Automatic annotation (TrEMBL):
<feature type="binding site">
    <location>
        <position position="94"/>
    </location>
    <ligand>
        <name>Mn(2+)</name>
    </ligand>
</feature>
<feature type="modified residue" description="Cysteine sulfenic acid (-SOH)">
    <location>
        <position position="166"/>
    </location>
</feature>
<protein>
    <recommendedName>
        <fullName>MobA-like NTP transferase domain-containing protein</fullName>
    </recommendedName>
</protein>
<feature type="binding site">
    <location>
        <position position="172"/>
    </location>
    <ligand>
        <name>Mn(2+)</name>
    </ligand>
</feature>
<dbReference type="Pfam" id="PF12804">
    <property type="entry name" value="NTP_transf_3"/>
</dbReference>
<dbReference type="GO" id="GO:0016779">
    <property type="term" value="F:nucleotidyltransferase activity"/>
</dbReference>
<keyword id="KW-0479">Metal-binding</keyword>
<feature type="binding site">
    <location>
        <position position="170"/>
    </location>
    <ligand>
        <name>Mn(2+)</name>
    </ligand>
</feature>
<dbReference type="InterPro" id="IPR029044">
    <property type="entry name" value="Nucleotide-diphossugar_trans"/>
</dbReference>
<feature type="domain" description="MobA-like NTP transferase">
    <location>
        <begin position="5"/>
        <end position="153"/>
    </location>
</feature>
<dbReference type="InterPro" id="IPR025877">
    <property type="entry name" value="MobA-like_NTP_Trfase"/>
</dbReference>
<dbReference type="GO" id="GO:0046872">
    <property type="term" value="F:metal ion binding"/>
</dbReference>
Length: 184
């Protein structure tokens, strides 16, 4: 069997993906973390900033999927998932603070669940695990924004992985980016 990681980075904003962070970029930092997790396959989704991202970073070893400018980038990423993968670990391109250890833990215990989320000190957060059994439902969401409602639904047995600290910062605004740079 296989485990595929999916990084969603198609979010509209200088592109937010290319903002400087820890000697690299925000997206570069996220991908650096994903590359350490031991995924058999890594899929990255990009939007309108695709060309800019490509020219700024080497995307070696990652399956790049491009959408137009939330968009339904998860739907098209699923099309790339290898047949022998029993599910996906889902990560967001603007959440570079995700710990490699958390990814290894969810890779370990995630496959014994239909859906798994991380339980932080201040609530539910990424990474998520989705079993192949829910790929159809994921594809039928209007956009990437619909995942949040799904992981809080009682329709599936959503399991929780306990993680120390609070939820990684989701870098959308300038205030978010300021908060990210502050913690070092
Ligand atoms: Mn975001």
């Amino acid at each position: 069997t296989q485990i595929t990681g999916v990084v969603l980075a198609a979010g509209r904003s200088t592109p937010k993906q290319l903002l400087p962070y820890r000697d690299t970029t925000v997206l570069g930092a996220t991908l650096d973390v994903a590359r350490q997790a031991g995924f058999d396959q890594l899929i990255l989704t990009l939007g309108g900033a695709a060309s800019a991202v490509r020219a700024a970073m080497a995307l070696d070893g990652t399956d790049v999927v491009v959408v137009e400018d939330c968009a339904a980038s998860l739907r098209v990423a699923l099309a790339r998932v290898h047949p022998r993968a029993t599910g996906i670990v889902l990560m967001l391109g603007d959440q570079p603070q995700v710990a490699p250890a958390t990814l290894r833990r969810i890779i370990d215990v995630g496959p014994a669940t239909e859906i798994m989320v991380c339980r932080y000190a201040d609530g539910v957060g990424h990474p998520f695990w989705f079993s192949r059994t829910v790929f159809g439902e994921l594809a039928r969401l209007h956009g990437d924004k619909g995942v949040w409602k799904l992981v809080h639904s009682g329709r599936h047995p959503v399991r929780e992985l306990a993680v120390d600290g609070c939820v990684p910062l989701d870098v959308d605004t300038w205030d978010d980016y300021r908060r990210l740079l502050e913690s070092v």
